[PDB]
Every structure is written in C-alpha cells, then in structure tokens.
C-alpha cells in the first residue's frame, strides 16, 4: 500500500488534544493564557521538546506570543472581542527526526468579556 508504522516511538504528545481556555478580551498585550505540556512519560527528558506555531494565521501570530524555551502561551497585543469573537490555532512540538516528529494540538480560546461580568 503506502505505509503502516508499527512499534514504539517516543514522539512528543500533548496532554490535551484540544486545549480549551477562556481569554478575557480585556487581556493586556502580555497576559498569560495557558501552558502547553509535552508529557513524555519519562519522568523527565533531556529537554528536547519545543513549542512553535503550527497552523495559525498572520493576525494570530502577531496578536499572541508563545515561548519555545518554556512553552508558555500568552498575549502579545491588545485583544478586541469585536475583531475576533473566538480564536482557533494549532501548535507544533518538535522532538526528534528530520523533519522531527511534530505533534499538532488544537487550541480553542473563548474570547470572554470582563466588562460583561454579572453584578
């Protein structure tokens, strides 16, 4: 046929397939959203797992910032629920291989509102 991998692989895998979190539209250009874990089930690896942008837009890469050295996802520029009611992108995680086994993980962010907080 075409392919049929079978065996064992220490490829990078995120805890949650689709990271769902609520982001307050009134989130500063440097507000922490969430963190992308890469559990390797090795009780601690040699730190060979980074976090980069997989399938995102040009307005998402400039509106949000993600650290590859730590893997922490936060805001980069002001967010206006008006311009966006709900963002949706994907993050990749390289480990080993050329190209390295990159794992994709959907990240749903619900643009909430702080001003619309019930009294």
Swiss-Prot record:
Expressing tissues: Expressed predominantly in brain and heart and at lower levels in various other tissues.
Subcellular location: Cell membrane
Ranges of residues in domain Cadherin: 15-119
Name of the protein: Protocadherin-7
Lineage: Eukaryota, Metazoa, Chordata, Craniata, Vertebrata
Domain of life: Eukaryota
């Amino acid at each position: 046929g075409s392919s049929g991998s079978s065996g064992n692989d220490n490829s990078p895998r995120f805890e949650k397939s689709v990271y769902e979190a609520d982001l307050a539209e009134n989130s500063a250009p440097g507000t922490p959203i969430l963190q992308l874990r890469a559990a390797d089930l090795d009780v601690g690896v040699n730190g060979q797992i980074e976090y980069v942008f997989g399938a995102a837009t040009e307005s998402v890469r400039r509106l949000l910032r993600l650290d590859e050295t730590s893997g922490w996802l936060s805001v980069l520029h002001r967010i206006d629920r008006e311009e966006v009611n709900q963002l949706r992108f994907t993050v990749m995680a390289r480990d080993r291989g050329q190209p390295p086994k990159t794992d994709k993980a959907t990240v749903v962010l619900n643009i909430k509102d702080e001003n619309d907080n019930v009294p």
